[PDB]
Amino acid sequence: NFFPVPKDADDYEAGKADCVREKEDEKGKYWLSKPIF
Amino acid sequence: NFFPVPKDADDYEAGKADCVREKEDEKGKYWLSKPIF
Amino acid sequence: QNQPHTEVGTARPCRSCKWQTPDPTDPHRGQCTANRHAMGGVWKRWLRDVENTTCSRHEEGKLSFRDHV
Amino acid sequence: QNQPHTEVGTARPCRSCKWQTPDPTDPHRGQCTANRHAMGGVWKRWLRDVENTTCSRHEEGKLSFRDHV
Amino acid sequence: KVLEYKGKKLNFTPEDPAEETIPADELHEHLQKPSTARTKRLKERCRWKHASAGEFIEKSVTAGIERMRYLTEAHKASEGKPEAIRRALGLANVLNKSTLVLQEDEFIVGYHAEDPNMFPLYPELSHMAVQDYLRSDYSPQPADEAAAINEYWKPHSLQSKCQPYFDPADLGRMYQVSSMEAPSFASGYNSIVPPYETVLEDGLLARIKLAEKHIAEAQADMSTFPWNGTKGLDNIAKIDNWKAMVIACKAVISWARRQGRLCKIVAENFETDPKRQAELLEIADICQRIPAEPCKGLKDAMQAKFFTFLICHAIERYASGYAQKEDTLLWPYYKASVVDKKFQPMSHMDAVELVEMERLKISEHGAGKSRAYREIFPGSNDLFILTVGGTNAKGEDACNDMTDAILEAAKRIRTAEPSIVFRYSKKNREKTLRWVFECIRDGLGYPSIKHDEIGTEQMKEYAKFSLNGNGATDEEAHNWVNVLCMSPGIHGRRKTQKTRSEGGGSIFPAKLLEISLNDGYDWSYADMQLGPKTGDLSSLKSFEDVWEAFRKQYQYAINLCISTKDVSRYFEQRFLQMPFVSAIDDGCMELGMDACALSEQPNGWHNPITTIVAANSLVAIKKLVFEEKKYTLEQLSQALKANWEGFEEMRVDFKRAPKWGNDDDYADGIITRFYEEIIGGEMRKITNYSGGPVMPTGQAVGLYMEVGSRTGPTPDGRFGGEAADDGGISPYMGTDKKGPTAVLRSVSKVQKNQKGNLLNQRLSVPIMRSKHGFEIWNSYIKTWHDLNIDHVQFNVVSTDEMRAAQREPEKHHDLIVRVSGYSARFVDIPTYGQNTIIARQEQDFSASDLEFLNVEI
Amino acid sequence: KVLEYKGKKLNFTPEDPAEETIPADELHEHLQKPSTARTKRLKERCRWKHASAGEFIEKSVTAGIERMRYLTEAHKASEGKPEAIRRALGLANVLNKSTLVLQEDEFIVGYHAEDPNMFPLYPELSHMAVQDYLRSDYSPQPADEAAAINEYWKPHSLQSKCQPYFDPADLGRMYQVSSMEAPSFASGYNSIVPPYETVLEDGLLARIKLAEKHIAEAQADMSTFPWNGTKGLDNIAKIDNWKAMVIACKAVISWARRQGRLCKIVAENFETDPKRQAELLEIADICQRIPAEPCKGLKDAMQAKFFTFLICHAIERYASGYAQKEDTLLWPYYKASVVDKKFQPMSHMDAVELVEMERLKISEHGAGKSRAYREIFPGSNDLFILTVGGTNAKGEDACNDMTDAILEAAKRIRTAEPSIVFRYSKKNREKTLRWVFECIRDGLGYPSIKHDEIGTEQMKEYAKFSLNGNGATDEEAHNWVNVLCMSPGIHGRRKTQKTRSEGGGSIFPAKLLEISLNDGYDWSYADMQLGPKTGDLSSLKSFEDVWEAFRKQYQYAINLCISTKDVSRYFEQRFLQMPFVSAIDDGCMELGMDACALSEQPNGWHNPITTIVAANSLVAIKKLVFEEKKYTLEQLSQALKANWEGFEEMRVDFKRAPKWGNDDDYADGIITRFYEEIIGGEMRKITNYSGGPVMPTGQAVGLYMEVGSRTGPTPDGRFGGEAADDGGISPYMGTDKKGPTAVLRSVSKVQKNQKGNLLNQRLSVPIMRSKHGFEIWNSYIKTWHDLNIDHVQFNVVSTDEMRAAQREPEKHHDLIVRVSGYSARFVDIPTYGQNTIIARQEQDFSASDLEFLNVEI
Ligand code: SF4
Ligand code: SF4
Ligand SMILES: [Cl-]
């Protein structure tokens, strides 16, 4: 899942987005957000 | 021309030698000594 | 021969022995924990080299944390 | 047009002109020595860029040291 | 059960009548009460990352590679730039590119590696530690990249910078961790006291604006006619440090806000419950404002503190610890939220829940520390010690309702970490003492208790050596916390300890004693020369000769211990700058200096561990070899070399010789001198980087186990490889035969040349859990305080229950015990260590004990 | 021809009757007399490497790549190591791997690049300078490797380290070399005074043994109980510097001995004449012992000095210059060889020959300096200025037979370099004055003459500012040399100037004046803002306003000039350490400090060049615009902007206004104030790295030509692009109309706030070459000395001969003339520069001139 970085964000650069994915293991559910282009 | 470095020289290392060649141009004659292995 | 001794290119290095755990600072070194006393002491021996050392007590494997110090 | 002026991708850059000699510090810059006075002055002009500047006095070539400052 | 005292019969029946019949061996499985359904859930699914015996307990815990990868990329790209700026660029790249993590049910959010089961590594510190990780089951992956990374950093590593200034034989000796702890430059282990106060009350945007102003002024200074080259060049390092601070702070803000954006994204795209959606947006807003801006309420403060903790202890650099004065730090924000309701209005129980959540986040903080430091804190993630209580600038009570919220959260959620230190003063309100006792009587092992006045006096004394005459003021000297387990240090916006190179690191008297009797040669562990050749057995013709041999072994060892720390300091400030930490220190900011360079409050110390084994050994040597001449030293030495086999009658003689902790004159006269004249007296001759003395903080963590296993048989009666003593000044397990107040009397005799000393005591469960428990404990503490004793901490746990947890660990998950300076999950401790805790004497109080304590019922 | 003086008729017929009929236009082609067939041969085949107009005169002269290649290889391999050690490893790799050169007929042997037509480059200094070489016909080859090398060094270069601490607009202004010389960090240009005395009398083996001892002591210090971290850490930088010294010295010995082995190999395998074979073995033996051991004779000393020169000026780092007190330095060895015959027995004429050979080796030393520095020394390889004469520690005559051998060698061999400075005292023996005059009357242009007492006093004054209170003692203050052309500095085993960052670099009043009249804007050369906006034309309502505008332009410029030097100093000692130079400085060796870090004798200066154009311009402005109000400033400015076209009558008015050098009150009152109050007075407000003041050394080299060409028309009457004045304090060419003693009277008026000032004068050939020449010259010098004038140097050359050499350069190869502070081969100077020398007034002496000089015939 691909979410373009808000253009007014401190870390905005052209073409930059947060890749967000949901995971779940024996302990529980979580979300990871990695910056991509 | 290949001259093995004297084994008691400060710069002696195994297999090291001075390559010495004579050159001459419009100004005059000279000799170059480059270390090789 | 039941004490650590050099044996170059041994098939049974300390590194693979269940009694060995790596040195606290330098992973090239090891700790032999084989000398276990009836009163509970774990009387370790320092291993200078875990690739080329062995002894007769060598046993391939890995102890759980429960059985180490 | 007999004074240095920008002309992007010119066939006749200052860099190749006999009147040009490179800047003393930065070889991207140049010195135009074309303005030579009858009383001997060599009234130089500084060149910001020698690849994309030219003028009508452009003449390909190289002066010997004798004719420079 | 029943005791007669001053013409009354005291009945030690439990306060909760239900406990009369709960089997002794399962008591602690009944005590947790998380304040909300949420914190109950968070605990049940907690991603603990305990390590013992050099390994992680759980297969799922494993190293991350992102930090390694992005630090390397930045380092290659920044070649040629000033080092402080290179360091800021490294942190920024790590923060800019890191995968961030959000977990279900969290309110305090954030993490320090790319996955909640992971932890980061530190190739810039110790190349050996990384190599050890690469050889483990929990290696970063892909292994080939990680290996290439470690090879890239090796010539640049702190370890590689420091090693050339020492004799290789000396480093080999230290690296064994038998007589000396390995220097921090070789392991990467470290500690820090972050100036949290600055972040919470200024925010980072203000720090940036401040550095920018300093930079503009310095550049103006450099262009002012007439230049003075003996002054104007000072601006270069200042400008470099300030520019680095700006880069670091901007990156931290950006990272916090990106964490915030992940909450927003999950709320809008993943989370289906409107309740959690609203909560996630509330967290997203906090992260947007904090730590960029000043904190306004308690939720702000808690999140600002956690973010600051992640940068200072995990991301910018590894540092053990959780040092902070948590009640005094959070009080203004508690007051704003809970009392005045001015921003983020909350109930006291809401505050208790927020603290529970903090304890659970710390319980999930896995530490990328080296093999040695995965050995010596068995049953925990790492050391996390926070401080509460004590006194304020005017010497009045510092306890408050935030202190009580912190203590109640600990009692309720029952996590082994973070541990708590309570600074005890006669000023401290009873309402808060009662909460301290609720934790202790439940067997948590904390709060440990520190003597408030001793610590405060200590801060005043060190302040006098300040190199720029800006040590703690008399009022500031009341502002102190333990840095790791035991040693006081200043907290606040300025003058805090920035590195373990200032103080910390250990030295091991038991091993030093052993090699003293063998001319410096370690025959039993490493089979090599371990210390100086201080004299063979025949040259030791008197007890004074034995004493002097130990002295020389100790002098040689402690000199290496401190000099290796000061060399590390020299290079940390030159190549391991911490521009984020510098930016939030008022002194660093003001002077344009790196956090490791500037040292306004000296705090030099080193840790004697296994002291009482050495001391008991010396006492027995004196009595049996030299006074009574029952055995020659050659006879002792032959016995020792046999691990006493064939010599059991000699062993039992040495075992029964007078021992520390029995208020016995013979032992205590020798051992008091040993502490004061050698352990403290010799160390204090050394001056560190900061220009103050170095004094001992006696303690033990799990090193009393690891060093025990590397130490041969000793004249106190140990067989080879048995545990050493458990504290800085505890009786050796099972040798205190005169009860709890005899122990206090021994311990009180050591009064000179100490920085602190850890005392472990274990109290009878029925008494402590009876209705008389608080009164007896409060009297114990009052008496302990009058005797001018530095420290005490308590186990309150039955042997039955510990043995049951050994047999059936899966039925005893909530059993927590005190190890030494920290608490642990008992079933996560190796059997060897568990047995040392069971062997600690469970103390009962006789009526003469109670009279000595001036107990009133 | 004939002059009447005190009732005698003086006849100015030449001393050699043959010269009566030798055409005036070929005189100097008759004067060389090399002392031996060998030095005649060496001169005829001399590999001169003259540069003019930014290029080398000869196509055969071209850059080498070996130094670049081997420095790079070492730098990559040494990542992580301490910088001082990295620098030593770089030099060692260069020395270990360099091709060495032996030429026919040489006795003094050695070279600094891989082929006798070549010279080395310096990618560690200025990336721009290397890029300029890559764009030239004399690029190092292969070009692709050289380019890769420059890209590798760029982020590490001294230029890249220093630029970030300055406003980019300020650097752009300096880099133009119009109002300010570019800072050394941007060009790589530099200078040094090597402690030769240490090498010759100790040898390098002793220095090594000394550093090794310091290291052993420092390591012992660090392991001594009890450690003190406020002291013991000082050993780290010391040990690093000493280890670096050892690496450097061992490499230098090895390189010398390998040079020696090449002589042996040629003798045994290539050379067929038994005479030369024996000589080659004699040289081989000298190279084996020297510089490892102390020198024993003159041949030893000469070869030790040349090797030291190559390391300090070319191989370890680029440095212009040849500073040394050559007669005092070599005297002990001359005495041993020539007088006592104790080792290497030799005749005085043998010594003269050895000096001739030295002059020829220096004449072959090509310099890998940047484009600017291939522009401003037209007709020479580089600046090479040695010093002789003066006084000893007791204030007595320092002249001796070695001085005379050095002067006779110069007169005989007629090389333009090295140039000579003669320190003149009334103490100096006539026998040696006569040799000084033999050189001057032959038109060599040197010895230039420096005032001995002024320089010695100066050394005492600077010594007072020493940062470690170890400046020159009163006796040591007599031990001085010119560093490059003009400025005194200490020579000896200790306290010598190590870098041009201490003192050197120029500033250009003529350009500053021009932009003063245009609100800081340079309309004529660069078309951009060049200085501060000090006020438009209408705001300049009085002469005082014009004066103040210049003042502000000068203050802005001189502040950048010194601050850029001090920043360079900061980084040189941190990343450009010179461990070989450190090892041969007694202070560096003793304190374990780098040569650029330690500064025991301050010597701050900067060079005003084009001063008299500015000064004459100001005088004319005052008289015509403000006093007589003949023209408004708007009228002047309109004329200037027209290059005076249409305004010739105005130009001639400004040209004929009073001028410096005519002993005219109106001009001289204004110009004296200008020197003392602005040029010196403002500069002296600045303090440099070494903690002393910065004072002006007025001079010109070839910058008076280059800056002239970048300067517009000025109110002294110049058209745009015409040359500036030729000295620090010379009358502008052709404006001194009152004779030679009027010039002395003007010049003598400037007495405050100067470090030195270069005076060029040109004397009539017939008088100087007549039998009355010496008497008139000796009287001139005595009078010049009484007037307390700092400096004077002389051309003695007919215009006929210079014009002939312009027409037919191939017939005038041996014509040498004085430029400014150095001498040149006239036919190797561009026509523009040649014409400025022809325009210098050839001075005749009237009988009133001779009376003023108190001449006695
Ligand atoms: S092989 Fe022998 S010496 Fe090695 S670890 Fe195992 S038991 Fe110890
Ligand atoms: S092209 Fe024109 S401006 Fe450029 S160097 Fe030649 S003459 Fe000068
Ligand atoms: Cl601690």
Ligand SMILES: [Cl-]
């Ligand atoms: Cl000079």
